[PDB]
Design a protein around this ligand. Structure first.
Ligand code: KBL
Ligand code: MG
Ligand code: ZN
Length: 313
């Protein structure tokens, strides 16, 4: 009850900032997550015994892949923590509960391969889930873990609040399918500009939470340059492995995934920043002004990639 998580001074201060890196000490990440739940939601919203057991089962169901791993899960949860803490009064109690858990669970049992590779491989999951293949699997894995004995962290919610929070988590995890991001942001851009955007309109909130999920999911591009640059290695380690597996199916992979075309990564990063990341954080800053530091950090990293091409690094 009166058992608070407390971080060392540097972490206590820096965890509040959007560009916080959770560090290389894996055994501190569960504590970092509980700390964020306690401060973002309250010391009462989850039973610590059940939360701790849920966290360790979620950890166990992330794989030993270069990028789509347990560290990514906690990193994405921290970006969501930073957004919720900088927008105190905009979100309900259930939303704050749902979204931290959604971010922690959003890539459960990821194998480091895209929806495209599963379909071309003809993986069983592609027959079970025709669109947002891995994202439907991630939500399925979340419900499975919630249903383990002693793992239902929502047990003390009413029946309607329980159905609401599982609905929040489902939409939040589906929204991390980047194929859905393009149309979601376009609609939000139209609604903001025409002035029709209404946060009391449930379908509008859903769209805003989807954009928050894209923003947290892509947040490696909002870190200090050395973190962004070193995370890019892990991201491209998976892309190149997938490229290898495409060549084994007798398919030339797109340049993004071809380890022979390593030279084209810097220009590939420019396209991603300009087509995905900058537009994402721009629209997010328009709807939620206090998230502006994510856009500023993203712009700084675009400028660093431009310097890489110009041979200045
Ligand atoms: C090429 C590229 C470079 C990157 O740096 C990143 C990236 C930065 C942060 N996260 N993240 C990321 C996100 C999903 C999976 C793996 C990594 N993403 N892409 C990327 C990924 C999927 C589709 C895609 O084409 C699209 F979006 F245009 F359809 C582009
Ligand atoms: Mg994902
Ligand atoms: Zn992710």
């Amino acid at each position: 009850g009166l058992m608070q998580f407390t971080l060392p001074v540097r972490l206590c201060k820096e965890i509040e900032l959007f560009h916080f890196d959770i560090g290389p000490f894996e055994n501190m990440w569960p504590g970092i997550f509980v700390y964020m739940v306690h401060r973002s939601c309250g010391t009462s919203c989850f039973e610590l015994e059940k939360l701790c057991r849920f966290i360790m089962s979620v950890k166990k169901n992330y794989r030993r892949v270069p990028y789509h791993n347990w560290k990514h899960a906690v990193t994405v949860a921290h970006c969501m923590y930073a957004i919720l803490q900088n927008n105190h009064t905009l979100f309900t109690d259930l939303e704050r509960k749902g979204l931290l858990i959604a971010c922690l669970c959003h890539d459960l049992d990821h194998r480091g391969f895209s929806n495209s590779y599963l379909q071309k491989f003809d993986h069983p999951l592609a027959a079970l889930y025709s669109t947002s293949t891995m994202e439907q699997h991630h939500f399925s894995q979340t419900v499975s873990i919630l249903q383990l004995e002693g793992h239902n962290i929502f047990s003390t919610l009413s029946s309607s609040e329980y159905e609401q929070v599982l609905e929040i988590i489902r939409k939040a995890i589906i929204a991390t399918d980047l194929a859905l991001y393009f149309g979601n942001r376009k609609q939000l851009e139209e609604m903001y500009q025409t002035g029709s955007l209404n946060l009391n309109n449930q379908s509008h909130r859903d769209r805003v939470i989807g954009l928050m999920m894209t923003a947290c999911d892509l947040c490696s591009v909002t870190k200090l340059w050395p973190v962004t640059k070193l995370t890019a290695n892990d991201i491209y380690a998976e892309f190149w492995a997938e490229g290898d597996e495409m060549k084994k199916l007798g398919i030339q992979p797109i340049p993004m995934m071809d380890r022979d075309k390593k030279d084209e990564v810097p220009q590939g990063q420019l396209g991603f920043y300009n087509a995905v990341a900058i537009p994402c954080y721009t629209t997010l800053t328009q709807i939620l002004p206090p998230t502006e530091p994510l856009l500023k950090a993203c712009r700084d990293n675009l400028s660093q990639w431009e310097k890489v091409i110009r041979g200045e690094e």
